[PDB]
Amino acid sequence: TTFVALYDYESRTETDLSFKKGERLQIVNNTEGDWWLAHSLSTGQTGYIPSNYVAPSDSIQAEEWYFGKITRRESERLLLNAENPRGTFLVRESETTKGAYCLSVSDFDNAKGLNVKHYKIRKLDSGGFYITSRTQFNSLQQLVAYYSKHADGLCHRLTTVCPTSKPQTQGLAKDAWEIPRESLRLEVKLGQGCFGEVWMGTWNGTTRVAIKTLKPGTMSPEAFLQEAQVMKKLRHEKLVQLYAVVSEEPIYIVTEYMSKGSLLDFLKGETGKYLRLPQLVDMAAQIASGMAYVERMNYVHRDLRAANILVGENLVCKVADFGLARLIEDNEYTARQGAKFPIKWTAPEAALYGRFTIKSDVWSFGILLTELTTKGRVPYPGMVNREVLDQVERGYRMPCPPECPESLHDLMCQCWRKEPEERPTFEYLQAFLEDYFTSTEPQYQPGENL
Numbered sequence: 001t002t003f004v005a006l007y008d009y010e011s012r013t014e015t016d017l018s019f020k021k022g023e024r025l026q027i028v029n030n031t032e033g034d035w036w037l038a039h040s041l042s043t044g045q046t047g048y049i050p051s052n053y054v055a056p057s058d059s060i061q062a063e064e065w066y067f068g069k070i071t072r073r074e075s076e077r078l079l080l081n082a083e084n085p086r087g088t089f090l091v092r093e094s095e096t097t098k099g100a101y102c103l104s105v106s107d108f109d110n111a112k113g114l115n116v117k118h119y120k121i122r123k124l125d126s127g128g129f130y131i132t133s134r135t136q137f138n139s140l141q142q143l144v145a146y147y148s149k150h151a152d153g154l155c156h157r158l159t160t161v162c163p164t165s166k167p168q169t170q171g172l173a174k175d176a177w178e179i180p181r182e183s184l185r186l187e188v189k190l191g192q193g194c195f196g197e198v199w200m201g202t203w204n205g206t207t208r209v210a211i212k213t214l215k216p217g218t219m220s221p222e223a224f225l226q227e228a229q230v231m232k233k234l235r236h237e238k239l240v241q242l243y244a245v246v247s248e249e250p251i252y253i254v255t256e257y258m259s260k261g262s263l264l265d266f267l268k269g270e271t272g273k274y275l276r277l278p279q280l281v282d283m284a285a286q287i288a289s290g291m292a293y294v295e296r297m298n299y300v301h302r303d304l305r306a307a308n309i310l311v312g313e314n315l316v317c318k319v320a321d322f323g324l325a326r327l328i329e330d331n332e333y334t335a336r337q338g339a340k341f342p343i344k345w346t347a348p349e350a351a352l353y354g355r356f357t358i359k360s361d362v363w364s365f366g367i368l369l370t371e372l373t374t375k376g377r378v379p380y381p382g383m384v385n386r387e388v389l390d391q392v393e394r395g396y397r398m399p400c401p402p403e404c405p406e407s408l409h410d411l412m413c414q415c416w417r418k419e420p421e422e423r424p425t426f427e428y429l430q431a432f433l434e435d436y437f438t439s440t441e442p443q444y445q446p447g448e449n450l
Ligand SMILES: Nc1ncnc2c1ncn2[C@@H]1O[C@H](COP(=O)(O)OP(=O)(O)NP(=O)(O)O)[C@@H](O)[C@H]1O
Pocket: 190, 191, 192, 193, 194, 195, 196, 197, 198, 210, 240, 255, 256, 257, 258, 259, 261, 262, 303, 307, 308, 310, 320, 321
């Protein structure tokens, strides 16, 4: 009946419990959802813990190398990390065959360099588990134990478990949402937007967070609180999580801190000097993935651009600042006008008639695509804000960027169709970009290569 910690966790409050990976814990109350009351069997300490940091003892989820429901693409990003020795692996659920699993392994070819090999694990009618029919096992852990000693047909002996980063807890702590202004300490100014500032800081003197401040008069706290309730329910690995808020003016917005900064700045400079097409297309794919979730949830971003995409380790990109723009009470901004309104990323029907939809976000994604292929160069280079809308209304569209493949420029043009409903979906954009360089995420090795 005991559980086991999958990761190390540091206590953030007076009532939660710290633990180290591998510690055995007794859930002495699970009547909650994301935060459970636990008791450490080794230390005797009690306290709340994030439910996504533990797994039932002896379960397959308890296995260090079992990544469960991770896609083939996501598993590849993790395995291809430069630090990973050859033979680094993970096991996950197969996407094409229900009930089946998959062993993904990192390999190096002197005529292909670093690469990932995928092997589908089928479970017979009897009960055996196998990659090759000439070798079956009664369990996934038995299989893994075998190939850790002998490659036996695999690209390399299983050597190291794929490392990963601690998952985000849902909320800063149990029941924390509308928090006291004094629970935060601002430490490093990260930037100054148009309606406030952003700082790297600390919550409760223990947790690293990002804090955005809104100048009084920007938007009504009441409307803000209603909208924050909606955004709070949006959870996806390619969306920056909203942690907590201080609803009274000056309004505070606490989200997860992205150390690598914005995509725009990462695009310009030295960080993006040797950035090649395959990298830029993968970042675009991640962005389309988060926006497809937004699409599935029937939500609307309203301010999509490279400045609003954040970067993390493993070239991870996350969609930020969604929903807020709609609350701005600024008179000029409300009329899609002013030096504060991002007209260069706005679809004509949104600017002209205020018709903001997932389709106008698709138009914005097309513009973002140009920043990604021009090292962050500003859209419509020779045009001033005040003349952009009239030009685009008459049919003007940016030409193919220098060095950008025409095929990608064609995608942008689809996103910029005059008819919003003729514009592609984010589901489509994600699939197109993920499979851009011949790779619809298929192909599994056969079995015995020698
Ligand atoms: N969660 C975060 N983690 C790290 N840095 C962040 C984070 N959020 C914002 N920033 C940084 O802060 C600046 C953004 O401030 P912000 O007020 O959001 O301006 P913006 O980029 O101009 N767009 P907008 O907010 O739509 O007007 C950029 O330097 C970002 O890198």
